[PDB]
Amino acid sequence: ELPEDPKWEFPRDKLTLGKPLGEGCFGQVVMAEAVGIKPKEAVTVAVKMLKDDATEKDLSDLVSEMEMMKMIGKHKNIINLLGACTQDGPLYVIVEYASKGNLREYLRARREQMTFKDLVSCTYQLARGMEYLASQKCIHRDLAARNVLVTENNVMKIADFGLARDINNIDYYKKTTNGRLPVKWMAPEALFDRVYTHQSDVWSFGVLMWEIFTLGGSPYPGIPVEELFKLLKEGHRMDKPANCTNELYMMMRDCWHAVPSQRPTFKQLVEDLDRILTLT
Amino acid sequence: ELPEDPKWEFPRDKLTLGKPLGEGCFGQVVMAEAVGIKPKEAVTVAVKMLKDDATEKDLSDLVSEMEMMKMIGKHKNIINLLGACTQDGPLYVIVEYASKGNLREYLRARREQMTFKDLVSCTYQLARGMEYLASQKCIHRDLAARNVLVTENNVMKIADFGLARDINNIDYYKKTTNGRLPVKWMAPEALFDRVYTHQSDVWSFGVLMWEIFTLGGSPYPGIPVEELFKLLKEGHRMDKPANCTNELYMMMRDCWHAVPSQRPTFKQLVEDLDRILTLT
Amino acid sequence: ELPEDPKWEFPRDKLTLGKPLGEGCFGQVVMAEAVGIKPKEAVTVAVKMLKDDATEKDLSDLVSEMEMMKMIGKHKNIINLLGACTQDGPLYVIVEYASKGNLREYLRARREQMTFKDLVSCTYQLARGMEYLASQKCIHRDLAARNVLVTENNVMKIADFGLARDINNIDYYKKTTNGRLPVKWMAPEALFDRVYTHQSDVWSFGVLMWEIFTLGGSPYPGIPVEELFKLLKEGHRMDKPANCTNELYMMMRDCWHAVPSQRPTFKQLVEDLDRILTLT
Amino acid sequence: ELPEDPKWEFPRDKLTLGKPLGEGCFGQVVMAEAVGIKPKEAVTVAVKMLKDDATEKDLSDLVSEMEMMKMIGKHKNIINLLGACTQDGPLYVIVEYASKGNLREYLRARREQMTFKDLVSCTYQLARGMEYLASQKCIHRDLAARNVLVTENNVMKIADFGLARDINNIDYYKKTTNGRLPVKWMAPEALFDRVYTHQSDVWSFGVLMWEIFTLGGSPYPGIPVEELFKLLKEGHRMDKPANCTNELYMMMRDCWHAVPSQRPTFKQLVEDLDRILTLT
């Protein structure tokens, strides 16, 4: 069924499935070993695949992710596509391995210990990944702590491109109903106006920052998603984490402006975060 | 946001959340204790709820399930709706507790041991639940071993009504695209013709039977979902499990006829299974 | 493909297609003559059918309409389902004939002349049809002047049930994205909150009233649908038509409350309109 | 709401709306006059716009079309985008005027008269337009005679890009359910397999050829869309038009192979049609 891509194809025998890194959304990821990089030696990788109960959406999401990672390209702050097994057999999406796990559980672990300097560096990396993504005209639509993995030496990598989109020529104005995006990370226009732009992603980034400065904290604590629909219209926003500068909290608050155009771009978030890092 | 239902409402203070029974699809279920049944004493129950990352689909699915369980009614072979916390707070769907877990893991466990007599009794119960469901004009759309729970004393109960539908006056002809149903359990008309009827559910039941007689076996072993789309058109079907009568295997094969009308009804499946049970 | 319904089936030879009443949404309607009513004589009817370029949505909409008209039942203020040709051949939905055409063009015609007494009577009939619809637990989702036909002797009949829904057991909370409803007639919760209730229909009724008291006027004159999304949030509403009582305009304004629960029910609209008719 | 595009924006005062060219799908088109081309003089154009009853889908389709025409670019066999009025007011999509109307009604008119030489030239132009479209990685999804307009001097132009898609980086594998495409022009994989490729467009082209050689004939005459779902699986295809060469009919039959890969590409259709034109 799946078409073929010569430049990304990888022989099934050079891969050795192993330990399951953890189940999830539309499938599961398992640690594997691959022979082929240009050294031609066995390197640890992560293989994303379907479960036995996969649905057509699961299939289309996994395929979509593989295709998105190809147009996005190479960058140090996003999980890179290494190869893929599509021909004669089960779809296998080969991406790079992240030994530390996802940012959420990672952060919640060290609360050795961790420092503020790290948090700002951590946020800066993510802002850099998102700026690249935006230059590539891609909207992630699902940026969150759980969707960011950390490798050895602690490199922050944005993952899970199953919901991402190509905005190069088409923006899907009044077409994206966004019913599959987690609500606590959604911008108001996404929730109510059937649109999604890079500006919608900055809102989510602000929520991601909050997650970082609360060390894996749960957004809108004590507030169920069900009542968040009215609160967001009333102008409700989250308050400052007791481990955040007043300048950092203003970035968050800026990412959360009702009007998209008034929110900062990823380029600005990079520049401003750059300064804040030097002075720490 | 959620409307109110006096007859099904249950006070939040009479419920005591506990151990998480296991994460999943569009939320999580946790063991809880409720005071109110008519004895007015603390009985163990299961509470279905949303996670922090819930989406609007997750929300609409959970609400849909609660509404479906209300029109379906009471029966001994389906998980019954006990109560629900909708007013002022997080949605809580209170259903009955199943101490043994789901049919799949249950079966895979005992392979004390188990007997053939049990398997036929197990299949008969499920056929009975499905016959009731059909009389209520409800199509489940997701019948599988993982979606059947077993209580103490071993009562088989069909669960997970998140994808079910009300076919009383509307059948959704050419409207149901069924992209969220697991493919290995889907009937051909469901996969290709944009329809779903009670007959589509019998196909799934046949796959459920196979799962039972293989003791939690994985349908279409060695065949990835991706290539199942062409095979199903070619007339491919699963073979007889080495623990199944020749008469039982014919029921399966009958549930898998390309033409829906040629498949048996749930009423027939009940009658025929009734006979087969007596003669064991 | 289409299933069979003995009680509604009608022989293809007893029907004689004729003049096309006018193309449209998902198909076309043509004047026809049928032999079979219980007199057994030739009576003029209207036959809804697909065009050569029909889509699967067109097909599913037309079938959905036929099924909705069956659960709704018989009433003097809605177009009634007379019969249907489903077996061996092109789907034919046989409904009652409306010699005067749709309410919009009808009204715009006489601006012999028409009187205010008529407008209130016209509005009262429609309010009555909608009250019945609501008791049957059906949400129309597309109430407008163009969707109301007038017969000989001037009986107002609500038509076009292609978008209607069965709310008996399921309400589709957070599932109805309503992207196919005309925006100038949509309630705010329908446009932004992924819900639709009987209260959403009263909003549309208010817009229908405005259309009547402006004699087929276009809602939100001088305002393109594209800018209506922001205006509706700002609290913008239409002003009083120069042919409407101050009491009538208050009904409209009541149907347009941001909060659904604060809007009048169809039962109240019937009672209040009843009084207003007597005193004219 | 709509974003801004400096290079495509056109002043509202330089445009003068006129005669309505004909209502339709998700809006209406009207003949207009524009001052600005680089001569800076009044030239006749066609303006696509929304009606009063537009839906969000109508809006998103019209916007999508404008965006597609921008990535597609300039070519002599497709209607070109001249300008657009998006800022402060009703969306206006300015495209080039086609004085003769659509290919279907055009053909059905002359049955002075027309010649076979014309039909082959007509088909060749369309094959050329489609080859360009495909090189631009765009899938039309709605190629038909009604969607092809003819200008003065008889230039064939492919129109209506409301359903088209950008396949540059994403192909939508198992995501396109295609419920809004007219069935008599759909390829089998489109109808049943949730995919759409350039090969799916060649199938539609074959149906377009049939329409040409039958002079605006209706595909699958005497066969309702409702029964076409089973017939297409049985291997049913249309027969040779009594005004078509045996070599031409083989092209049609080649475009209609069940297996996509076995169908000819648009490049081949251009080469082969090129030869056939010379020898006429």
Short mmCIF file of N, CA, C and O in Angstrom, two decimals, chain A residues 50-146:
data_model
loop_
_atom_site.label_atom_id
_atom_site.label_comp_id
_atom_site.label_asym_id
_atom_site.label_seq_id
_atom_site.Cartn_x
_atom_site.Cartn_y
_atom_site.Cartn_z
N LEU A 50 3.13 0.54 14.75
CA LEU A 50 1.73 0.33 15.11
C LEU A 50 1.55 -0.88 16.02
O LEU A 50 2.40 -1.76 16.08
N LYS A 51 0.46 -0.87 16.77
CA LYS A 51 0.13 -1.98 17.66
C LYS A 51 -0.83 -2.84 16.86
O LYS A 51 -1.18 -2.50 15.73
N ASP A 52 -1.29 -3.92 17.46
CA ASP A 52 -2.21 -4.82 16.77
C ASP A 52 -3.59 -4.19 16.54
O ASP A 52 -4.27 -4.52 15.57
N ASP A 53 -3.97 -3.27 17.42
CA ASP A 53 -5.27 -2.61 17.34
C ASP A 53 -5.28 -1.28 16.60
O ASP A 53 -6.21 -0.50 16.76
N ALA A 54 -4.26 -1.04 15.78
CA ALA A 54 -4.18 0.21 15.02
C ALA A 54 -5.43 0.49 14.19
O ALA A 54 -6.12 -0.42 13.75
N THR A 55 -5.72 1.77 14.00
CA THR A 55 -6.89 2.19 13.23
C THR A 55 -6.34 2.86 11.97
O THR A 55 -5.14 3.05 11.86
N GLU A 56 -7.22 3.21 11.04
CA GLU A 56 -6.75 3.88 9.84
C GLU A 56 -6.18 5.25 10.19
O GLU A 56 -5.27 5.73 9.52
N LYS A 57 -6.70 5.87 11.26
CA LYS A 57 -6.18 7.16 11.67
C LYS A 57 -4.78 6.97 12.20
O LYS A 57 -3.89 7.76 11.89
N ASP A 58 -4.58 5.92 12.98
CA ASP A 58 -3.27 5.60 13.55
C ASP A 58 -2.26 5.46 12.42
O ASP A 58 -1.16 6.01 12.47
N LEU A 59 -2.67 4.73 11.38
CA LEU A 59 -1.83 4.48 10.22
C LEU A 59 -1.50 5.78 9.49
O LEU A 59 -0.35 6.06 9.18
N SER A 60 -2.53 6.58 9.21
CA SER A 60 -2.35 7.84 8.51
C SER A 60 -1.53 8.85 9.32
O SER A 60 -0.82 9.67 8.75
N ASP A 61 -1.64 8.80 10.65
CA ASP A 61 -0.88 9.70 11.51
C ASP A 61 0.60 9.36 11.46
O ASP A 61 1.44 10.24 11.28
N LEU A 62 0.90 8.07 11.62
CA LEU A 62 2.28 7.59 11.60
C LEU A 62 2.96 7.88 10.27
O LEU A 62 4.12 8.27 10.23
N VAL A 63 2.22 7.70 9.17
CA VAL A 63 2.74 7.96 7.83
C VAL A 63 2.95 9.47 7.67
O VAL A 63 3.98 9.91 7.12
N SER A 64 2.00 10.26 8.18
CA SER A 64 2.06 11.71 8.11
C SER A 64 3.29 12.23 8.83
O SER A 64 3.98 13.13 8.35
N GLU A 65 3.58 11.64 9.99
CA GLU A 65 4.73 12.03 10.79
C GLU A 65 6.02 11.80 10.01
O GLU A 65 6.88 12.68 9.96
N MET A 66 6.14 10.64 9.38
CA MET A 66 7.32 10.29 8.58
C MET A 66 7.53 11.30 7.46
O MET A 66 8.65 11.71 7.18
N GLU A 67 6.44 11.68 6.80
CA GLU A 67 6.48 12.63 5.70
C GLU A 67 6.82 14.04 6.17
O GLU A 67 7.49 14.79 5.46
N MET A 68 6.35 14.41 7.36
CA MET A 68 6.63 15.73 7.92
C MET A 68 8.10 15.87 8.29
O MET A 68 8.73 16.87 7.99
N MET A 69 8.65 14.83 8.91
CA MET A 69 10.05 14.85 9.31
C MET A 69 11.01 14.98 8.13
O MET A 69 12.16 15.40 8.31
N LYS A 70 10.52 14.66 6.94
CA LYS A 70 11.30 14.74 5.70
C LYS A 70 11.34 16.14 5.11
O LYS A 70 12.32 16.51 4.47
N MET A 71 10.25 16.88 5.26
CA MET A 71 10.20 18.23 4.73
C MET A 71 10.83 19.19 5.72
O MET A 71 11.35 20.24 5.33
N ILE A 72 10.74 18.85 7.01
CA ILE A 72 11.30 19.67 8.07
C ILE A 72 12.82 19.71 7.94
O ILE A 72 13.43 20.78 7.93
N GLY A 73 13.41 18.54 7.79
CA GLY A 73 14.85 18.48 7.63
C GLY A 73 15.60 18.21 8.91
O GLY A 73 15.03 17.72 9.88
N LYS A 74 16.88 18.56 8.88
CA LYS A 74 17.79 18.35 9.99
C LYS A 74 17.99 19.58 10.88
O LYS A 74 18.22 20.69 10.40
N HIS A 75 17.91 19.35 12.19
CA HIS A 75 18.13 20.38 13.20
C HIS A 75 18.44 19.70 14.53
O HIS A 75 17.93 18.61 14.81
N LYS A 76 19.26 20.35 15.34
CA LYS A 76 19.68 19.79 16.62
C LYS A 76 18.63 19.78 17.74
O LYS A 76 18.80 19.07 18.73
N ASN A 77 17.54 20.51 17.57
CA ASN A 77 16.51 20.54 18.61
C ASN A 77 15.18 19.85 18.30
O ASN A 77 14.16 20.15 18.92
N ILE A 78 15.22 18.92 17.35
CA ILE A 78 14.04 18.14 16.97
C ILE A 78 14.53 16.72 16.69
O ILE A 78 15.67 16.53 16.25
N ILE A 79 13.70 15.72 17.00
CA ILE A 79 14.08 14.34 16.73
C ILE A 79 14.18 14.15 15.22
O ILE A 79 13.24 14.46 14.48
N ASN A 80 15.34 13.70 14.77
CA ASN A 80 15.58 13.50 13.35
C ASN A 80 15.24 12.11 12.83
O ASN A 80 15.42 11.10 13.52
N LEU A 81 14.72 12.10 11.61
CA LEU A 81 14.34 10.89 10.91
C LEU A 81 15.61 10.23 10.36
O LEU A 81 16.32 10.83 9.55
N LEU A 82 15.88 9.01 10.80
CA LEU A 82 17.07 8.29 10.34
C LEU A 82 16.79 7.39 9.12
O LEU A 82 17.57 7.37 8.16
N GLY A 83 15.68 6.66 9.17
CA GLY A 83 15.30 5.77 8.08
C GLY A 83 13.88 5.26 8.26
O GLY A 83 13.21 5.59 9.25
N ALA A 84 13.42 4.42 7.34
CA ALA A 84 12.07 3.88 7.42
C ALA A 84 11.90 2.60 6.63
O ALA A 84 12.38 2.48 5.51
N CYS A 85 11.20 1.63 7.22
CA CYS A 85 10.92 0.36 6.56
C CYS A 85 9.46 0.39 6.13
O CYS A 85 8.55 0.20 6.95
N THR A 86 9.24 0.65 4.84
CA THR A 86 7.90 0.73 4.28
C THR A 86 7.54 -0.44 3.35
O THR A 86 6.40 -0.91 3.35
N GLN A 87 8.51 -0.89 2.56
CA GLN A 87 8.33 -1.99 1.60
C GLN A 87 8.24 -3.40 2.19
O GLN A 87 9.08 -3.80 3.01
N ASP A 88 7.23 -4.15 1.74
CA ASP A 88 6.97 -5.54 2.15
C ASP A 88 7.10 -5.81 3.65
O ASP A 88 8.08 -6.41 4.10
N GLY A 89 6.09 -5.39 4.41
CA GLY A 89 6.10 -5.59 5.85
C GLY A 89 5.49 -4.44 6.65
O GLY A 89 4.94 -3.50 6.07
N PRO A 90 5.54 -4.51 7.99
CA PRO A 90 5.00 -3.48 8.89
C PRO A 90 5.79 -2.17 8.84
O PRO A 90 7.02 -2.18 8.86
N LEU A 91 5.07 -1.05 8.77
CA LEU A 91 5.71 0.25 8.72
C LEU A 91 6.58 0.47 9.94
O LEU A 91 6.17 0.19 11.08
N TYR A 92 7.79 0.92 9.69
CA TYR A 92 8.75 1.19 10.75
C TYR A 92 9.32 2.58 10.54
O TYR A 92 9.91 2.85 9.49
N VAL A 93 9.11 3.48 11.49
CA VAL A 93 9.67 4.83 11.37
C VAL A 93 10.87 4.90 12.31
O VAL A 93 10.74 4.83 13.54
N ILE A 94 12.06 5.00 11.71
CA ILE A 94 13.31 5.03 12.46
C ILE A 94 13.77 6.45 12.74
O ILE A 94 14.14 7.19 11.83
N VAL A 95 13.75 6.82 14.02
CA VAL A 95 14.16 8.15 14.44
C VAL A 95 15.27 8.02 15.48
O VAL A 95 15.55 6.90 15.94
N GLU A 96 15.87 9.14 15.87
CA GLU A 96 16.95 9.07 16.85
C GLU A 96 16.50 8.81 18.27
O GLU A 96 15.40 9.20 18.68
N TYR A 97 17.35 8.09 19.00
CA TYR A 97 17.12 7.68 20.38
C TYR A 97 17.37 8.78 21.41
O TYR A 97 18.34 9.54 21.31
N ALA A 98 16.47 8.87 22.40
CA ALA A 98 16.57 9.85 23.48
C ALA A 98 16.59 9.09 24.80
O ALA A 98 15.54 8.77 25.36
N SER A 99 17.80 8.82 25.28
CA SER A 99 18.02 8.06 26.52
C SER A 99 17.37 8.54 27.82
O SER A 99 17.05 7.72 28.67
N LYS A 100 17.18 9.85 27.98
CA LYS A 100 16.59 10.41 29.21
C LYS A 100 15.06 10.39 29.30
O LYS A 100 14.51 10.55 30.39
N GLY A 101 14.37 10.21 28.17
CA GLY A 101 12.92 10.18 28.20
C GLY A 101 12.30 11.52 27.86
O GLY A 101 12.96 12.37 27.27
N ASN A 102 11.03 11.71 28.20
CA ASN A 102 10.36 12.97 27.90
C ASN A 102 10.59 14.03 28.97
O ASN A 102 10.78 13.72 30.16
N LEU A 103 10.57 15.29 28.54
CA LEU A 103 10.80 16.44 29.40
C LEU A 103 9.96 16.48 30.67
O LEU A 103 10.47 16.86 31.71
N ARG A 104 8.70 16.09 30.59
CA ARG A 104 7.84 16.11 31.76
C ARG A 104 8.36 15.23 32.90
O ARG A 104 8.68 15.73 33.98
N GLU A 105 8.44 13.93 32.66
CA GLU A 105 8.92 12.98 33.66
C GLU A 105 10.35 13.30 34.07
O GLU A 105 10.74 13.12 35.22
N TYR A 106 11.13 13.78 33.10
CA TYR A 106 12.52 14.16 33.34
C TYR A 106 12.55 15.23 34.43
O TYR A 106 13.16 15.03 35.48
N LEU A 107 11.85 16.33 34.19
CA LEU A 107 11.78 17.44 35.13
C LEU A 107 11.23 17.03 36.49
O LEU A 107 11.82 17.35 37.52
N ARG A 108 10.10 16.31 36.49
CA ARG A 108 9.48 15.88 37.74
C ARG A 108 10.41 15.01 38.59
O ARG A 108 10.23 14.91 39.81
N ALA A 109 11.41 14.41 37.95
CA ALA A 109 12.37 13.56 38.63
C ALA A 109 13.27 14.35 39.59
O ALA A 109 13.30 14.07 40.79
N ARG A 110 13.97 15.34 39.05
CA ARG A 110 14.89 16.16 39.84
C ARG A 110 14.31 17.45 40.44
O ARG A 110 14.70 18.56 40.06
N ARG A 111 13.43 17.31 41.43
CA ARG A 111 12.80 18.46 42.07
C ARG A 111 13.07 18.61 43.57
O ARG A 111 12.58 17.78 44.37
N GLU A 112 21.13 13.82 40.33
CA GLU A 112 21.31 15.04 41.17
C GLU A 112 20.25 16.09 40.84
O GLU A 112 19.52 15.95 39.86
N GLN A 113 20.19 17.14 41.67
CA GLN A 113 19.23 18.21 41.48
C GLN A 113 19.42 19.03 40.22
O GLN A 113 20.34 18.79 39.43
N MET A 114 18.56 20.03 40.04
CA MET A 114 18.61 20.88 38.85
C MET A 114 18.70 22.36 39.22
O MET A 114 18.34 22.75 40.33
N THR A 115 19.17 23.19 38.29
CA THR A 115 19.30 24.63 38.53
C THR A 115 18.47 25.49 37.59
O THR A 115 18.04 25.05 36.53
N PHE A 116 18.27 26.74 37.99
CA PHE A 116 17.51 27.70 37.20
C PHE A 116 18.19 27.96 35.85
O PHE A 116 17.53 28.10 34.83
N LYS A 117 19.52 28.01 35.87
CA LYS A 117 20.31 28.23 34.67
C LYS A 117 19.93 27.19 33.61
O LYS A 117 19.82 27.50 32.42
N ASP A 118 19.69 25.97 34.08
CA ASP A 118 19.33 24.86 33.21
C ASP A 118 17.97 25.11 32.57
O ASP A 118 17.83 25.00 31.35
N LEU A 119 17.00 25.52 33.38
CA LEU A 119 15.64 25.79 32.89
C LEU A 119 15.60 26.82 31.77
O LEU A 119 14.87 26.66 30.79
N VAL A 120 16.39 27.88 31.91
CA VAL A 120 16.44 28.93 30.89
C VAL A 120 17.13 28.40 29.63
O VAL A 120 16.78 28.79 28.52
N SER A 121 18.14 27.55 29.82
CA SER A 121 18.86 26.97 28.69
C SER A 121 17.94 25.99 27.97
O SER A 121 17.92 25.93 26.74
N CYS A 122 17.18 25.25 28.77
CA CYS A 122 16.23 24.27 28.29
C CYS A 122 15.15 24.95 27.45
O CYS A 122 14.81 24.48 26.36
N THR A 123 14.63 26.07 27.95
CA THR A 123 13.60 26.84 27.26
C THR A 123 14.14 27.47 25.98
O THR A 123 13.42 27.57 24.99
N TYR A 124 15.40 27.91 26.02
CA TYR A 124 16.05 28.55 24.88
C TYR A 124 16.21 27.57 23.71
O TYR A 124 16.01 27.95 22.55
N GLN A 125 16.58 26.34 24.02
CA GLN A 125 16.75 25.31 23.00
C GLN A 125 15.43 25.07 22.28
O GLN A 125 15.37 25.08 21.05
N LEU A 126 14.38 24.89 23.06
CA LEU A 126 13.04 24.65 22.54
C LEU A 126 12.57 25.81 21.66
O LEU A 126 11.97 25.59 20.61
N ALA A 127 12.88 27.04 22.08
CA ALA A 127 12.49 28.23 21.32
C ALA A 127 13.23 28.23 19.99
O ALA A 127 12.72 28.72 18.98
N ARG A 128 14.45 27.68 20.01
CA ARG A 128 15.25 27.59 18.80
C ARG A 128 14.68 26.54 17.85
O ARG A 128 14.59 26.78 16.64
N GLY A 129 14.27 25.40 18.40
CA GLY A 129 13.69 24.35 17.58
C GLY A 129 12.45 24.87 16.89
O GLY A 129 12.29 24.73 15.68
N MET A 130 11.59 25.54 17.66
CA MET A 130 10.34 26.09 17.14
C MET A 130 10.52 27.19 16.11
O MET A 130 9.67 27.38 15.25
N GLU A 131 11.62 27.92 16.21
CA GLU A 131 11.88 28.97 15.24
C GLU A 131 12.22 28.32 13.90
O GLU A 131 11.79 28.79 12.85
N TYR A 132 13.01 27.24 13.95
CA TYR A 132 13.38 26.52 12.73
C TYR A 132 12.12 25.93 12.10
O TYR A 132 11.87 26.12 10.91
N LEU A 133 11.31 25.26 12.92
CA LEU A 133 10.07 24.66 12.46
C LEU A 133 9.24 25.67 11.70
O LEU A 133 8.79 25.39 10.59
N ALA A 134 9.09 26.85 12.28
CA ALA A 134 8.31 27.93 11.67
C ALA A 134 8.88 28.44 10.34
O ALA A 134 8.13 28.84 9.45
N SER A 135 10.21 28.43 10.23
CA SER A 135 10.87 28.89 9.00
C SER A 135 10.60 27.88 7.91
O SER A 135 10.51 28.23 6.73
N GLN A 136 10.43 26.62 8.31
CA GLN A 136 10.13 25.54 7.38
C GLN A 136 8.64 25.51 7.04
O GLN A 136 8.17 24.63 6.29
N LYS A 137 7.89 26.48 7.56
CA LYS A 137 6.45 26.61 7.34
C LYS A 137 5.64 25.44 7.85
O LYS A 137 4.66 25.03 7.24
N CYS A 138 6.05 24.92 9.00
CA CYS A 138 5.38 23.80 9.65
C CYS A 138 4.77 24.21 10.98
O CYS A 138 5.42 24.89 11.77
N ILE A 139 3.51 23.83 11.20
CA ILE A 139 2.84 24.11 12.47
C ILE A 139 2.75 22.77 13.18
O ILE A 139 2.23 21.80 12.64
N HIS A 140 3.29 22.70 14.39
CA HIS A 140 3.31 21.46 15.16
C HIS A 140 1.93 21.04 15.70
O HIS A 140 1.55 19.88 15.59
N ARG A 141 1.19 22.00 16.25
CA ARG A 141 -0.16 21.76 16.81
C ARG A 141 -0.25 20.92 18.08
O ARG A 141 -1.34 20.74 18.63
N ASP A 142 0.88 20.45 18.59
CA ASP A 142 0.84 19.63 19.79
C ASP A 142 2.09 19.78 20.67
O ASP A 142 2.52 18.83 21.32
N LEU A 143 2.63 21.00 20.74
CA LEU A 143 3.82 21.27 21.55
C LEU A 143 3.50 21.18 23.04
O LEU A 143 2.62 21.87 23.53
N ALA A 144 4.24 20.33 23.75
CA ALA A 144 4.05 20.12 25.18
C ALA A 144 5.29 19.46 25.75
O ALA A 144 6.16 19.02 25.01
N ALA A 145 5.37 19.40 27.08
CA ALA A 145 6.52 18.80 27.76
C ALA A 145 6.62 17.31 27.47
O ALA A 145 7.71 16.78 27.28
N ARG A 146 5.47 16.64 27.43
CA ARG A 146 5.45 15.21 27.16
C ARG A 146 5.95 14.92 25.74
O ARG A 146 6.45 13.83 25.48
#
